[PDB]
Amino acid sequence: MKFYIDDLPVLFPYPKIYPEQYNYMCDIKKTLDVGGNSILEMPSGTGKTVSLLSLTIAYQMHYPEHRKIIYCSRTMSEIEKALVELENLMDYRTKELGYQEDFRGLGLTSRKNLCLHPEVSKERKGTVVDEKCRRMTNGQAKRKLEEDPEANVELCEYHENLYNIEVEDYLPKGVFSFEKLLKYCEEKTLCPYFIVRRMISLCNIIIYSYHYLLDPKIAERVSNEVSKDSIVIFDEAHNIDNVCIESLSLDLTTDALRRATRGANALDERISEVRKVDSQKLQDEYEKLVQGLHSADILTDQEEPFVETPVLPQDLLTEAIPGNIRRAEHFVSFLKRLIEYLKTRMKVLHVISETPKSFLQHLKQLTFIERKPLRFCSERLSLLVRTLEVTEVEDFTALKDIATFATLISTYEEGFLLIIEPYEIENAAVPNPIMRFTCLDASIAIKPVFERFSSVIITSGTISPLDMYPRMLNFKTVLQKSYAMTLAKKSFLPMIITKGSDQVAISSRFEIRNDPSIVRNYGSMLVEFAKITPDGMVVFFPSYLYMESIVSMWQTMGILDEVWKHKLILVETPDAQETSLALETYRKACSNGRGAILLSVARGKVSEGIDFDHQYGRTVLMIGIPFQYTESRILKARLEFMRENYRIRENDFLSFDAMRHAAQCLGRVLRGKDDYGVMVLADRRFSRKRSQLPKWIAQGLSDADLNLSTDMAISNTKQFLRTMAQPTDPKDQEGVSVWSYEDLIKHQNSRKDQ
Amino acid sequence: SLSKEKLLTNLKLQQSLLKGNKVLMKVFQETVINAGLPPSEFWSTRIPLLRAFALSTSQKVGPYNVLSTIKPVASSENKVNVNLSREKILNIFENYPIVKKAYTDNVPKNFKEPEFWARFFSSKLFRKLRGEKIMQNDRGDVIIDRYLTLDQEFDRKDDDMLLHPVKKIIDLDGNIQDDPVVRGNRPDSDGTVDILKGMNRLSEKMIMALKNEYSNQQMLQQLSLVMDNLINKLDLNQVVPNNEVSNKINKRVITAIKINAKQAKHNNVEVKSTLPIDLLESCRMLHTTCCEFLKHFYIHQKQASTVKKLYNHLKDCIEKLNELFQDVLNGDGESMSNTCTAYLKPVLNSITLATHKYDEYFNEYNN
Amino acid sequence: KKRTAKKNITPYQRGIIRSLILTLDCSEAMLEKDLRPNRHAMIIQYAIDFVHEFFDQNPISQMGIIIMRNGLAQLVSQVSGNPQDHIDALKSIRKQEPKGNPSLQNALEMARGLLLPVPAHCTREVLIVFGSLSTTDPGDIHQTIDSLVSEKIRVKVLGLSAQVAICKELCKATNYGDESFYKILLDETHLKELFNEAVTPLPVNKINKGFTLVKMGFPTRIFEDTPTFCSCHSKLVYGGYFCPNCHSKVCSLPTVCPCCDLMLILSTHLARSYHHLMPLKTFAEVPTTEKFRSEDCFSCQSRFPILKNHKNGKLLTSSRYRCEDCKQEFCVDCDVFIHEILHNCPGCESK
Ligand code: SF4
Numbered sequence A: 001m002k003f004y005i006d007d008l009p010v011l012f013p014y015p016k017i018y019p020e021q022y023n024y025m026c027d028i029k030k031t032l033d034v035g036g037n038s039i040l041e042m043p044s045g046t047g048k049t050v051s052l053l054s055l056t057i058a059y060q061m062h063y064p065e066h067r068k069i070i071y072c073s074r075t076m077s078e079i080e081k082a083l084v085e086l087e088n089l090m091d092y093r094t095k096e097l098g099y100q101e102d103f104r105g106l107g108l109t110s111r112k113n114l115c116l117h118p119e120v121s122k123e124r125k126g127t128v129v130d131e132k133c134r135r136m137t138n139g140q141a142k143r144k145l146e147e148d149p150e151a152n153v154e155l156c157e158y159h160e161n162l163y164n165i166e167v168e169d170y171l172p173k174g175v176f177s178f179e180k181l182l183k184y185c186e187e188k189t190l191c192p193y194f195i196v197r198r199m200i201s202l203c204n205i206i207i208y209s210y211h212y213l214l215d216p217k218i219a220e221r222v223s224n225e226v227s228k229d230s231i232v233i234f235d236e237a238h239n240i241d242n243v244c245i246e247s248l249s250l251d252l253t254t255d256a257l258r259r260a261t262r263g264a265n266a267l268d269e270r271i272s273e274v275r276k277v278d279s280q281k282l283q284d285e286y287e288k289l290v291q292g293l294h295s296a297d298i299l300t301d302q303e304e305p306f307v308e309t310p311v312l313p314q315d316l317l318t319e320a321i322p323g324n325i326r327r328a329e330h331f332v333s334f335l336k337r338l339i340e341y342l343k344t345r346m347k348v349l350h351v352i353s354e355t356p357k358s359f360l361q362h363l364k365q366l367t368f369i370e371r372k373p374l375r376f377c378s379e380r381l382s383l384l385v386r387t388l389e390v391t392e393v394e395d396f397t398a399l400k401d402i403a404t405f406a407t408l409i410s411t412y413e414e415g416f417l418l419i420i421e422p423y424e425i426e427n428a429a430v431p432n433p434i435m436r437f438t439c440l441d442a443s444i445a446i447k448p449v450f451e452r453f454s455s456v457i458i459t460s461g462t463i464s465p466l467d468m469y470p471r472m473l474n475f476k477t478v479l480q481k482s483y484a485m486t487l488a489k490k491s492f493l494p495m496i497i498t499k500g501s502d503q504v505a506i507s508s509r510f511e512i513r514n515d516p517s518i519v520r521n522y523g524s525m526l527v528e529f530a531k532i533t534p535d536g537m538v539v540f541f542p543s544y545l546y547m548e549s550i551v552s553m554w555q556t557m558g559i560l561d562e563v564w565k566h567k568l569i570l571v572e573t574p575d576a577q578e579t580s581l582a583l584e585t586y587r588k589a590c591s592n593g594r595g596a597i598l599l600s601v602a603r604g605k606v607s608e609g610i611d612f613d614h615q616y617g618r619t620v621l622m623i624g625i626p627f628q629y630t631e632s633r634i635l636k637a638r639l640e641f642m643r644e645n646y647r648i649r650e651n652d653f654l655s656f657d658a659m660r661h662a663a664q665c666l667g668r669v670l671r672g673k674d675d676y677g678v679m680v681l682a683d684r685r686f687s688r689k690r691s692q693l694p695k696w697i698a699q700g701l702s703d704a705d706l707n708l709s710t711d712m713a714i715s716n717t718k719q720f721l722r723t724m725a726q727p728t729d730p731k732d733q734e735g736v737s738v739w740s741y742e743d744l745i746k747h748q749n750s751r752k753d754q
Numbered sequence B: 001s002l003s004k005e006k007l008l009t010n011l012k013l014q015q016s017l018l019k020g021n022k023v024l025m026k027v028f029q030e031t032v033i034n035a036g037l038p039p040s041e042f043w044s045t046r047i048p049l050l051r052a053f054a055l056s057t058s059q060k061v062g063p064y065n066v067l068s069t070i071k072p073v074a075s076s077e078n079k080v081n082v083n084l085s086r087e088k089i090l091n092i093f094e095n096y097p098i099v100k101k102a103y104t105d106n107v108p109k110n111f112k113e114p115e116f117w118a119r120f121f122s123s124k125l126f127r128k129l130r131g132e133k134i135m136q137n138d139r140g141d142v143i144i145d146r147y148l149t150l151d152q153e154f155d156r157k158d159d160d161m162l163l164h165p166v167k168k169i170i171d172l173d174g175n176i177q178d179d180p181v182v183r184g185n186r187p188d189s190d191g192t193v194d195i196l197k198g199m200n201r202l203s204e205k206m207i208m209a210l211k212n213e214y215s216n217q218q219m220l221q222q223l224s225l226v227m228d229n230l231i232n233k234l235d236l237n238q239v240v241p242n243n244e245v246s247n248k249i250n251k252r253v254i255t256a257i258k259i260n261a262k263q264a265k266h267n268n269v270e271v272k273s274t275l276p277i278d279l280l281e282s283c284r285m286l287h288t289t290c291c292e293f294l295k296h297f298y299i300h301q302k303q304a305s306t307v308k309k310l311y312n313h314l315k316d317c318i319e320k321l322n323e324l325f326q327d328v329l330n331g332d333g334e335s336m337s338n339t340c341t342a343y344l345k346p347v348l349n350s351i352t353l354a355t356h357k358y359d360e361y362f363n364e365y366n367n
Numbered sequence C: 001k002k003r004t005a006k007k008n009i010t011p012y013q014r015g016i017i018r019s020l021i022l023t024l025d026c027s028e029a030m031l032e033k034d035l036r037p038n039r040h041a042m043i044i045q046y047a048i049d050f051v052h053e054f055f056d057q058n059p060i061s062q063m064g065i066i067i068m069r070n071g072l073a074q075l076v077s078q079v080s081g082n083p084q085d086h087i088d089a090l091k092s093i094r095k096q097e098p099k100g101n102p103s104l105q106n107a108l109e110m111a112r113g114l115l116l117p118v119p120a121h122c123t124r125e126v127l128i129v130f131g132s133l134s135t136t137d138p139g140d141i142h143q144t145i146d147s148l149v150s151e152k153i154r155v156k157v158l159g160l161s162a163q164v165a166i167c168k169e170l171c172k173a174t175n176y177g178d179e180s181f182y183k184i185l186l187d188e189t190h191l192k193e194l195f196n197e198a199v200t201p202l203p204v205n206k207i208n209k210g211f212t213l214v215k216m217g218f219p220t221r222i223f224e225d226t227p228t229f230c231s232c233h234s235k236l237v238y239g240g241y242f243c244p245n246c247h248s249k250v251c252s253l254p255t256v257c258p259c260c261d262l263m264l265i266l267s268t269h270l271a272r273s274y275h276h277l278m279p280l281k282t283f284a285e286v287p288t289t290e291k292f293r294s295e296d297c298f299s300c301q302s303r304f305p306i307l308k309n310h311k312n313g314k315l316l317t318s319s320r321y322r323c324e325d326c327k328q329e330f331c332v333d334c335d336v337f338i339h340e341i342l343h344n345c346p347g348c349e350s351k
């Protein structure tokens, strides 16, 4: 199609359209006209990605100003989803237009999933791979190699071929999805990571995960060339706040503290030996401190920066010397005092939580070490290590942990809160004190971007209610609109199976435990569904331990034998690799004959990015409703902050979060409108939350479908599956809900110009 | 898998099919043991039967359920050789090498029928399937424990042999954490994780064992009007309606009809010498298939010498049947011989016509 | 309020000859309780009905029956042109009870093997009455599907109360892509009409393929009665036919000569074909108030026309569903009867 938005050619890649998509285009354009934020809940039953990209590409390529687009999907999985879809859009746009492209748009993830060097990438832990690539191609090992040709220094050489040809120019012209990028850069033997990383200065539109936007420890290279004005799109933004918090929290365990002790000892050895060999350079660095923050080589570092800056991006940093810390031995002694104070405060008997200011004063009491010198510890340690040009980091992992802790707790205040839990009550009365440190205000991490960028978007197939986010994140919006699934047919059957056959209220709320009534009830539910649905089914237990116990003692009964007799079982397990393997076998079985069941965790990785299309998902479940307070009081503290700072009570917030995750789980089971699928729930408490759900889910959830028993549930879903199976394709009722090629939109809404 | 020459040369298959049908082996031998046909062409007629049989044979059952089931759906019959005993055990063997190896190693001693399978219950059906028995009946001894130890690392190396570089849509590995280097929390108790890995491993092994791909006008109106009038002219004296008029005409009509009734009645919609009847039936079947081969060949074409052999044999068969009729007339007399001649008239005519047609074609080719 | 097919848009070609290999489903699934006796008994009954019907309307084709028990495909009737054999086979089966899982792959491979002898002008086909929700394959399936479509073997399947992805792929694959052949049912009557519509030959839009003249000859009945003698079953039969060329008796059939192997027919089979080739234009339902035509039937003489102004009754409709080319009326019963049983349109014959 090529219709108009009263100024904008739109090269929508499909002959068909959807109505909701057209409204989406209209409203997002209206947003881009006037600087605002205007969160927009478009049900995932449609294609939100196609609408977003089509309109935004057309806008950027039509007006002359907003030259760059930033797209932040939650996980690299959705990164490549957006990438492949964008590539197809681009091909369509060229095909309809000839060649008017001149367009580049690149994904951006990390070394671990990009480093092509065989031996390097053979490593598993991402941090190690990062370190290996750093050493193999640093500003220093290159000098060691070139000045001293020797077997000591090797290189990916992909960095070298880049240095030869790629950093004069760019990749040919494509919007390279990771499949395409990896294939090509394998052929031409390049290092994809550095390729895209340097390329950022030229890509018309960039796609990268949230962390690269909010995690200050990697959101450093944000080069306002990237936007300065750009139009920014948050896809799948319902889990924003937790990304901020997890980007700003921090953990401590006495064992890591002892590791830091070992690292400090190794540091003493290293400084001793080097100052025996060379100290004049160390004094030169003393002078480079005394002149200023040493930005000339604490910041002008093509390859150097060792310890990231966990504080917000340099906003809350001074630039003078850290006074006495200028001496390296002084610094080591400072860290010694710090770690010992941490140990003794760690031996505290029971739970204790403090404001950072309070803890700061207490440390001052025990050892008068001031805040201002403390803040500089991170870069101090990092550049000291650079001056030490150490051969390994594993010894210093705990050191950088402590540096991060010091910087955070010395920098921010009155938004964060310490807490010292001496143990894990799930195995209480054991030695395992943890110095948990976390933020409370989600808005802190976001605030810089809403400060920087002007026109931003928020979009998800699940966001609800559309007012909690302006509250929590403390940001101004314009258009807070929700879109309704205009369907000429039912197409999915939300239910609330509150009572099993025993007509007994059920949930996971009681405990994390057994109560054979509940267990047998759920097992009956699951097995009858496994009998009835065709290939493809999911479940979403509320928490991992819950699944572990439940399935263990299901296997105790014979319940699993029956579902074995019908379909396949594919559990969800903590190691990511095996999880991916299981998931792909699930897909392979669904599209094959045998039906297959995958049971996972709502909070877990599976729900985050994985998609469940027509075949791959028919009948999700929600065994229980996901809640967190199973574990300790960090949620309690954050909720305290919530109540005092925002006019929000506990159960309100808890229910809101729970329904957020529930909707995120549920929305996965549809892709288009041709798709369909049951979406059951299961708990007594669900019945009253019917309004918390996103609108388009609520519409399909009629009143009569509440607190149904399992039996009537099976009846209804049987009738559904049969009815949907029918080829109910009048194709004239689809002129209502499809707005066919170039005309029904044109006719209908060009008349609706009223 | 199935080819014309393949079924032609599948001699063991052909003899098996000979064993398949008494009628088949009978007709074949009397086409062979009677100094008749080489089996090659005899099957060349019957090829579809061979193909069908072969396909009905080499039909590997699926792995899948019964394969699994052989560990789950098989927990009751603690008696002797249970259901699908050999079938189930072979499903086990293809399903799990370890049990096959252990049973083989425990043939010369320690019978694996009763006591072998009894100890197997404990050992394996705890190893596979349900949770780690650990305590309780630790009968997993000797070969059982040895094979346990083996199978551990064996399944390990299998799983190793399973790892593909999954296409980067699904790559959860690269998806998780291998973008960043981050610091989270985690909070969501050993054993049973092995159970889950067990079911995953079983399923994937199954699927891989399946990806393995193993006058007109004026006067017309005038007369019409005349008749119309006649009708309208009262008339229509149904009394005068013929009745039969001429009694003679009536009689003649009856004659015609009784003649036709007789002739069509002759359609009465039981041999004497049952042994000679069966013998003649054998002769008919023989001559029929012989002529079958000619009328195949004489139509189709370069295997002229084969046609020549067929024709000489057919002429021999014709003379044979002539002598058969002579002997029948001699022994059975006339009435029985007449019945035999009647029974064999159609086939005799057909073969005679085939002989004459070949003679004509041979003369045409020669002259 | 009407439920009519708008137009027929392949009234130019069909597969007149056929070799359809119906494959039933006798496996543990078919023992559930959704259809009155079970799935299985009702299935076999309707299968018998369909066998009769199909061998009527396509009286020149063959057919073979295949079951799927215990993951095996066991041929229960050779591909043959005599309905009675298949009928008896089904009779025998119906007293036997299903077991094991349906091995769709094995049945498919057995068919593909089975239909090899069928010559080029004859057309192949399969009709899976798939009842279960799974298969159990001893091999790659897409391998088989690819082999199938390589061997030009259309397939139509009639699932029971669900939709299975692989079957949908199967139908979409062999039938030149054009997906319409995976129709699944929602009621017993729907099932009857399913088989009924399976009876007819199958066009979609045929690719330009080889069209070939086929040699065949017609027989002449025999006269004598006591001379009972047969050359296709080697019995005494009181009188039959003569191959015009082979010139040997053959018990009553449209069968192939068992001596010189050429097809035998009378003509009435060809007449059935003619009926299928060029059908009629669907009879139109005349306008309620704009007809002003004769108040009777035409082929019959029915008194069911109208009522002349009766608030809602006359406002309903005017039973005058009238064919186009002859432009004469016909009551509903007459139109149903013409378009179902006899296809010579009464008026359109007369002019
Ligand atoms: S970017 Fe190049 S040098 Fe770095 S890890 Fe990847 S392949 Fe190795």
Ligand SMILES: [Zn+2]
Pocket: C230, C231, C232, C233, C234, C235, C237, C250, C251
């Ligand atoms: Zn006969």
Ligand SMILES: [Zn+2]
Pocket: C243, C244, C245, C246, C247, C248, C257, C258, C259, C260, C261, C262
């Ligand atoms: Zn003949």
Ligand SMILES: [Zn+2]
Pocket: C297, C298, C299, C300, C301, C302, C330, C331, C333, C334
């Ligand atoms: Zn009528």
Ligand SMILES: [Zn+2]
Pocket: C323, C324, C325, C326, C327, C328, C345, C346, C347, C348, C349
């Ligand atoms: Zn007509």
